[model samples]
Target: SSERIRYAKWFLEHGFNIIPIDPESKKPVLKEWQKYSHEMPSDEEKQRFLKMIEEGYNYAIPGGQKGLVILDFESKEKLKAWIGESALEELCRKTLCTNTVHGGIHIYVLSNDIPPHKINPLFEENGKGIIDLQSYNSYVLGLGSCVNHLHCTTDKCPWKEQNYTTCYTLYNELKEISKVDLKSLLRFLAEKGKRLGITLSKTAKEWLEG
Candidate 1:
């Protein structure tokens, strides 16, 4: 748990707006997450977070802070499916990515190129779920920050075979996806289901309209 506090401090130093979440359930430990989602933490706030950590709260970096975005895959199988035929593979590969405690992929990006207000619905198939676009007002669990004391696979992630990298490096490699390119890819997936035929179940119509 002390390690989690250290990790949170490191995240704050690296320009990520951090918040604490319940270690077991991965839900926010604090009731007013939005109140703290914007700038870096204050000294008093940091002390509060450290105290929260002792109480079984792990840290999370909220999206929409400095245009952050996360593509959260629920599991390895889902990530494989996306990468199999995904035109977004290159996009994912270029950004800061890590593995969740459950072996899911968390693809990180920070780009003003994407529509700022856009938060897509969870795309699902066969009654199971896939990924969703997380941006403004959304969040992702940070690497090294644990859930139920189980560390995220980020120590050797993106994947060890690929590269053992840090979020700071990820921030450096953050690719800028133009709005035009984002829309085009979303449109392609919506209409054609290019990746595992996983079409947009809800966001498509409105996405296209916008």
Candidate 2:
């Protein structure tokens, strides 16, 4: 269902301002945040985090001119929790296979990393008994529902949203940032996450180097 139709009717009946495509005005629009993650920080927190995104961990880059990254979950919509530790392992190995075939590799995390732009600023995933494959700032990766439509994914969403139709703001955002000092640009985020009480994932892959 499109978040539009589902939330729109609620707003109209409940008396809320409907924006261009957003039907629900009472709650903040999805555009303002990223799903599977947490919300942005306050004035002080934002200042600190912006710095981390610019500097901090430039550990190593997974080498390749081009690579394929796949984000996985055994089942969808259960974003708040991991399906199971084994499931994560399975996906990690699978991602590695994909990486190997393409002369690339996979990344994992003890748990998911959170940011202000995400839905929750304080949400935490248990990293115990899991592998943390650090994947950040690598080009040409994929995500699940990483990009939100003004609507929703399934028909139940009711807003009649279409797949492969929405703009990938993250991609475009990165495209612009790529021209700048990519390391500093990434460190800002890493540092920000560290300050915000979230653990930044580690990055690794079979590159030409190691």
Candidate 3:
């Protein structure tokens, strides 16, 4: 309890917490879970978090003002193709990244400096949507939590009436979380894609102008 609280308190300014959402069912036990997301958790909320987590609820956090804007990628090949090899090496080694059970990747970075334009289908035109941009009020699965096959019943979910296990694995945890300025990062991506004449989302140009 003490150590978990210590880890959580480190992210309080960033609005981190484990709530009553079950990873298996993808259901929230607390009906008004959004209430705690407006600010740091109250003492009561904190206590409730630890208890629920111990009882098997997954850890989750809301993004935007107090947290990160996550770049949800469907595959590393697409991620490498979209961002290019040079940029991926620099960003991947330093940032917090997770590989979801179904082979998707979640890259967490900062963007508190500008207005949040959260997007689900980012960077089309080259093909299908490659990324989902997660921002404020988005309840996200944290590290040590897995979703996809089990929660959504896509594959291997009904293979057995068995107890659940974790498949969400950390892709990068050896280094500290990346603090790269998101505006600058977006500009870099846009500039690189322009050089290749690769057509991406016009939202990229819009965001760079923003």
Candidate 4:
């Protein structure tokens, strides 16, 4: 469909790296998504994705690809509770935050101020839900991607019905508020996890050491 191509082009134009995935399983169809993660899709690759789109494939955006970081929240209630009203208000000001079809939230942030890391980390987790700090080699389902015919809820979902808001504008709202680099950000998350009886995984610990 022309709309599918349009959506993919929008993402490409906005500096988000995208890939096609299975409609049912939602896993990437490509064997090696990492190879294409850092680089923008070539013209041939773009056509490949467009073909998949017409064939009912969903799409995804790799995190830390082009200095982007995606924070995936499993539930809106928890996300709201974790970040109070005042903070949430400031966060949504210019950030491209969206709700997923499955009642989750995806907050996109550009890590322009911070360098990308090799390992993707589950940055934060509360007992209620988890916040994935998707970086290097990590990916999130695209805003318009769909599964089982249910589209990812965003302002641009092909279906006119959208249960979520997708803000396209970007700002340095996160770094300004946190005032910390990647290392400090990890440390801060570690401390929060401690209070919730959560411990960083071995991979996460190694990430800290490295």
Candidate 5:
């Protein structure tokens, strides 16, 4: 026994159709049977999930982030501030629209539209950033946060209030838009980060000099 060791088998694939499961809300909307299947999903399930993906239900496929706007903390505030002043009213105007899923306002933005230089994280400790809404696509969406950037305080970020819902509205939106080619987005970001002063580590200064 001392001379033997074991490694779990694993495989890689393009993507999966994951039903939305909110841990906080404790809700399961998709077919439950799909959860237990592991060996190989049936053709019916695959078609349904893939259709849902077409409907903007799942997250980005692996190696995809083309139209994504990664947010951490301050960017949340900035988004709240911008939306509160302008877009929020328009969003409210369309609250009852059939296109709105989960009865919430979701927007999408393509990754290429976001200036790679500006995509830097908020705090190195917590990764976040503000996203530009214009870059979004109809098929993709970004989740809006609850915090009032203009009113948030040092003790707490605005994402905590019960008056708001999860800001992940854009999750599926980004997924939908980026499905065309996710790897390009990653490579572009890598290059953009290098071109700009954005560093991937705590000490950006050290990386800059290197």
Candidate 6:
């Protein structure tokens, strides 16, 4: 089995549900995968996932389900320029974090009800999102898999030249994954937004409501 399977098992053992996705497209390996967000994949289904992983499928942990949330940093510049590096470093010291292949990060914080949100600090682009918070029927990419296609496969311009892999590197895992109080995290972002003078955008996806 591949390393992806190993992490998938580990995550399942730890109570997080898993979904296998294509290595490049990140699309689900199984049909109607949204169901897995709440219903844990069965033992047999897991074995099937291992088979899929061995054949080269990546895995993602679900968040819309109660009990977890992820802060996926899509752009390092947005983070450093607006949120401040110390802010993130300090968060990792408390929670679990992983380094994405794009040189950004994925931060995992435990919680019951924190709606997903993303931000754009440039204050110019409307509805153009950067820095993402993956949850509620959405997911951050998993570890071990790599993205091998150019962005220009469809889009235009500078995106034409850059094709970066999506792999996860270990961050601070020495401690057990930390729990986050929903109140404090909102306040945390609220304060940062105040300082940066930018508003946070509530993500439009399968949120808490049906």
Highest lDDT model number: 6
Local lDDT at 206 for model 1:
63
Please report how far candidate 6 places residue 102 from its true position, in Å: 2.9
Off by over 4 Å in 3: 1-15, 35-37, 125-127, 148-166, 193-204
How do the residues 33-107 of candidate 3 rate in per-residue lDDT, one tens digit apiece? Answer: 665445566788777776776555566656564446777777776667767887887788778777765567788
lDDT digits (tens) for residues 135-183 of candidate 5: 1111122122122233333344434333443333332212222221223
lDDT, candidate 1, 1-210, per-residue tens: 455666666667666778878655557776777655465668888778767865657678787676676767666565555545354565565556666755667766665555444355546676555766776666777655654322344553334334232331222243432223455555655554454666564664465455
TM-scores for all predictions: 0.66, 0.22, 0.74, 0.67, 0.28, 0.77
What TM-score would you give candidate 1 relative to the actual structure? 0.66
- Tens digit per residue, CA lDDT, model 6, 39-69: 7778888878877776877777777665566
**Global lDDT of each candidate:** 0.59, 0.26, 0.60, 0.59, 0.30, 0.63
RMSD of candidate 4 to the truth, in angstroms, is 6.8
Q: Please, what are the lDDT tens digits per residue for candidate 4 over residues 103-201? A: 567666665554354443354454322556666677777655644323454543443354443322222232211222555545654664475555555
Off by over 4 Å in 6: 23-25, 116-127, 150-166, 172-175, 202-210
For candidate 2, lDDT tens digit of each residue in 98-123?
A: 12111222232222221111111112
Ranking by TM-score: 6, 3, 4, 1, 5, 2
RMSD of candidates 1 onward, in order: 7.1, 18.9, 4.2, 6.8, 14.8, 4.5
**Candidate 2 versus the native: TM-score?**
0.22
**Residue 17 lDDT (model 3):** 46
Clashing pairs in 6: none
Best by TM-score: 6
- Once fitted onto the true fold, the runs of candidate 5 whose alpha carbons sit more than 4 angstroms away are 1-16, 23-40, 43-157, 170-176, 179-197, 201-210
